[PDB]
Amino acid sequence: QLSARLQEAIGRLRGRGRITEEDLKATLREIRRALMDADVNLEVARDFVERVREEALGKQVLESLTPAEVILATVYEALKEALGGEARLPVLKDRNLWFLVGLQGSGKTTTAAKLALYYKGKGRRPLLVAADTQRPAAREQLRLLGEKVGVPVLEVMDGESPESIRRRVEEKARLEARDLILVDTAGRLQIDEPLMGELARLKEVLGPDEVLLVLDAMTGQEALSVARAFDEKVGVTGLVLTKLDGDARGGAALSARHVTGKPIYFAGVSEKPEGLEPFYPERLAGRILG
Amino acid sequence: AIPWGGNLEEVLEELEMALLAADVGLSATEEILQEVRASGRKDLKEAVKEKLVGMLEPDERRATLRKLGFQKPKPVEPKGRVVLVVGVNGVGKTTTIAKLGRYYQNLGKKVMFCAGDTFRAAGGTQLSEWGKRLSIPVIQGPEGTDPAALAYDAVQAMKARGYDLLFVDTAGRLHTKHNLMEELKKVKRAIAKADPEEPKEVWLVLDAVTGQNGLEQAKKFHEAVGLTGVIVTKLDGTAKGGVLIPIVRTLKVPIKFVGVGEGPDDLQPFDPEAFVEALLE
Numbered sequence A: 001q002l003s004a005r006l007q008e009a010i011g012r013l014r015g016r017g018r019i020t021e022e023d024l025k026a027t028l029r030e031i032r033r034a035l036m037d038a039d040v041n042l043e044v045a046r047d048f049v050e051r052v053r054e055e056a057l058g059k060q061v062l063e064s065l066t067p068a069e070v071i072l073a074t075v076y077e078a079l080k081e082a083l084g085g086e087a088r089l090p091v092l093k094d095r096n097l098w099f100l101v102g103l104q105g106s107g108k109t110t111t112a113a114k115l116a117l118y119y120k121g122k123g124r125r126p127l128l129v130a131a132d133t134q135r136p137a138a139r140e141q142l143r144l145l146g147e148k149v150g151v152p153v154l155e156v157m158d159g160e161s162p163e164s165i166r167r168r169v170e171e172k173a174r175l176e177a178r179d180l181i182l183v184d185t186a187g188r189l190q191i192d193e194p195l196m197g198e199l200a201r202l203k204e205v206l207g208p209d210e211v212l213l214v215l216d217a218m219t220g221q222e223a224l225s226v227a228r229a230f231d232e233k234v235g236v237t238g239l240v241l242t243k244l245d246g247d248a249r250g251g252a253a254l255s256a257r258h259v260t261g262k263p264i265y266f267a268g269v270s271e272k273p274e275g276l277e278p279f280y281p282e283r284l285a286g287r288i289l290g
Numbered sequence B: 001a002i003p004w005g006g007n008l009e010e011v012l013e014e015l016e017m018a019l020l021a022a023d024v025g026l027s028a029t030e031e032i033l034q035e036v037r038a039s040g041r042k043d044l045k046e047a048v049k050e051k052l053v054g055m056l057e058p059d060e061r062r063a064t065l066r067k068l069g070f071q072k073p074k075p076v077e078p079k080g081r082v083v084l085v086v087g088v089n090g091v092g093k094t095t096t097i098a099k100l101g102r103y104y105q106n107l108g109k110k111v112m113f114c115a116g117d118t119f120r121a122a123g124g125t126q127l128s129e130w131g132k133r134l135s136i137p138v139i140q141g142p143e144g145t146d147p148a149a150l151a152y153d154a155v156q157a158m159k160a161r162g163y164d165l166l167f168v169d170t171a172g173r174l175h176t177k178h179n180l181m182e183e184l185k186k187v188k189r190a191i192a193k194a195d196p197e198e199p200k201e202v203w204l205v206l207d208a209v210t211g212q213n214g215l216e217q218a219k220k221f222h223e224a225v226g227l228t229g230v231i232v233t234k235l236d237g238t239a240k241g242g243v244l245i246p247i248v249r250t251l252k253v254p255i256k257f258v259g260v261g262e263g264p265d266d267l268q269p270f271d272p273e274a275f276v277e278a279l280l281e
């Protein structure tokens, strides 16, 4: 399963007995390069191999008779941990309101319907909220998806205030006894201050319990910078990684976790409402390294 | 920024980290740095800019006039009447077609849209809304209709009406899905079935935030349908669209336009120099 590059780096060192510190640094340099190829941000990839270095030495890799096995195990182990360790799903309570936030076209509208269907199946009574008034047909988009998964959709009006939104949502959720409110917000640049302000004010007024950063698996080096800005300017609580049905390696997930420390709750694995899975750190660790 | 005028080693070290942060990739970054190191020039700034602009140029004449110390723009003309727009999910294909329509209606062309995303919820309606806003006729069908059949009807309608340009939208698809790539191929043939000369342009849409997967997108779509052009969207963001360097280097597909917003005017013809400048900013 391992990548061409890493098959060589570790293969080199098998059967040689003990290895030198130079051999370690040479290896860690190849792991670094491999992570950058897997779209891990370059500062994060630097820090990641420095973490590996400490752990490998803390396993006395210099004295080991199978040090290439030690190194490779420690990469697999450190990357799994850095991606969250074990599968972790959100903890729901009696009242639940979540935002879906992020960059343009990352999969927020589609993911909202996926979550609605997922939680419907678990006795939740979701409400979808079409809060994107700019993207053409965006409200019809979520309405059609809502109809497919058998979940109601509240559609925000043009120029409607957050206060008026809170009001109509509180009203419908109560009158319909709905305990999972899914707010689909428009994609925006992390540097677009008025729109990042709009999102912070919407958070301020609506008080979501979760704010899910929807991140496309093919996102490159800006992932760090994007995750940081959303979390500083708005405050993120969790992550959804989309388009994992592609062949992008998904290194942006490590960048996002590195700078935010937030869990990656879900994976998106198709265009259809069924295409949702719990996220498994180990599974993506393998993907990044393969 | 990159501290030009610093010692050689610090300049090259910063340039490496710049290209890598710009998503240019390990391979291409290595390519560029070896030759900048080899060609040994004091004017590192001018030497790098020349080479980068050089990959992103299918044309030595502009470089010739540049280095002769002479400068002209000139609007992008598609080679034929049908432009087929392709790429993966959420990259900006529909939004970009609307921008092209605004761009060409401003040059006085008769433009038609084919709303060929018959898969995604409101996939066709979305382009329909843009057609209304720009007063551009839109050929569309119900969700689930064969996009090849629709593409066919759209070329036929374009021909019947004496229109200059037809932009065929297509549903976003991942390049790992062979059946969707074959469907894409089938849409292309449907076009040629209505007019053998067409499509003269096949334009890939590429999102600027995309890292190294963008090269795999370009290779795989190229193989399926033959790219003639590439549009890079969301360049109004912090990302630099660096994966274009490996794309143009390896495939030699020209960059047609850049997308810099969510409105209809937020399109510009590609400027290799303004791009390289921003890349190293």
Ligand SMILES: Nc1nc2c(ncn2[C@@H]2O[C@H](COP(=O)(O)OP(=O)(O)O)[C@@H](O)[C@H]2O)c(=O)[nH]1
Residues within 6 Å of the ligand: A103, A104, A105, A106, A107, A108, A109, A110, A111, A187, A214, A242, A243, A244, A245, A246, A267, A268, A269, A270, A271, A275, B089, B090, B120, B172, B174
């Ligand atoms: N293949 C695949 N496509 C996805 C996934 N999630 C979203 N998409 C597609 O990506 C495109 C952008 O999605 P959309 O939800 O409209 O983006 P938004 O602007 O974030 O709301 C749509 O064509 C979706 O079908 C996924 O997990 N896999």
Ligand SMILES: Nc1nc2c(ncn2[C@@H]2O[C@H](COP(=O)(O)OP(=O)(O)O)[C@@H](O)[C@H]2O)c(=O)[nH]1
Residues within 6 Å of the ligand: A104, A105, A135, A187, A189, B087, B088, B089, B090, B091, B092, B093, B094, B095, B096, B172, B205, B233, B234, B235, B236, B237, B258, B259, B260, B261, B262, B266
């Ligand atoms: N900021 C910015 N957003 C863009 C650009 N091009 C497209 N988008 C946005 O990306 C999202 C998805 O684009 P869309 O045209 O639906 O993608 P498609 O799935 O390829 O048809 C929408 O929110 C667009 O407005 C651009 O150049 N800049």
Ligand SMILES: Nc1nc2c(ncn2[C@@H]2O[C@H](COP(=O)(O)O)[C@@H](O)[C@H]2O)c(=O)[nH]1
Residues within 6 Å of the ligand: A270, A271, B119, B171, B172, B173, B174, B180, B183
């Ligand atoms: N763009 C796109 N189209 C799809 C997808 N899944 C199904 N379709 C459309 O639906 C047709 C087949 O549907 P399916 O039989 O796979 O349910 C395909 O030929 C394609 O046009 C997808 O993930 N993306």
Ligand code: ALF
Residues within 6 Å of the ligand: A103, A104, A105, A106, A108, A109, A132, A135, A138, A185, A186, A187, A188
């Ligand atoms: F196009 Al979006 F959220 F970015 F609907």
Ligand code: ALF
Residues within 6 Å of the ligand: B088, B089, B090, B091, B093, B094, B117, B120, B123, B170, B171, B172, B173
């Ligand atoms: F949502 Al698309 F092409 F991916 F319109």
Ligand SMILES: [Mg+2]
Residues within 6 Å of the ligand: A108, A109, A110, A132, A135, A138, A184, A186, A187
């Ligand atoms: Mg949306």
Ligand SMILES: [Mg+2]
Residues within 6 Å of the ligand: B093, B094, B095, B117, B123, B126, B169, B170, B171, B172
């Ligand atoms: Mg579209």
